[PDB]
Amino acid sequence: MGSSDDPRDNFKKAVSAFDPKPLESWTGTFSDVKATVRRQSLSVAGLGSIPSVYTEATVPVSGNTDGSQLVVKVNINTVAPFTRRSPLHATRERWFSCSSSQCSGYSRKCDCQEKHEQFRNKCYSQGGQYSTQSSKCRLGEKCGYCKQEVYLSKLYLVAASDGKGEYRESTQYQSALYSFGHLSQGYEAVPQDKVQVQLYSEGDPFIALERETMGEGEFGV
């Protein structure tokens, strides 16, 4: 194990190691739409402008759906072909679980009613709908969840080096966006007629920044 006492050190090392030259060859198609290699610059306070390179295409939803899923066939030079299916629409549930941190009373017998009530009221203030599951909301209970409807707008994909100078879909990163799971994508509040698809390499500073800043895009609390 290793870790620096400088919070930005891991990020700086990633920036130094980043070689975008192979990515210039990332031409091809996304579901038969012509891809374009894009060179962007990140602005990171104290570190300046940072290169980032991805290949992208806008895929129409029409003609690229399989039931409720957008079907993205990645056919990019030097990247082993792969498909991502991603839901056009998701129902995002954020659950309130009663934990000791928000529990009122004697440890073994506490409940989170006040904090749950706040969470429920917060949901409605954010335009969500709430489902209450446990009113008593005792320690360890799943008390309820806030529900939001979202629609895929920007799909982030990640490729990793193979051993051999080319690329394949990343194992570790199912998205370039923190927290890097398959539903860590760009969403909007209403249905979309097209989706922007962006393919990054694992070592891109965009992904490093997402990681080292926990999605915030900048360092600091």
Closest CA to 207 of 184, 161, 175: 175
Closest CA to 78 of 18, 167, 197: 167
Distance of CA 210 to the CA centre of its chain: 9
How far, in Å, are 4, 13, 45, 82, 215 from residue 221 at the CA level? 17, 21, 14, 38, 12
CB atoms within 10 A of CB 130: 15
Distance of CA 217 to the CA centre of its chain: 13
**Enclosing H/E stretch for 10:** helix 9-17
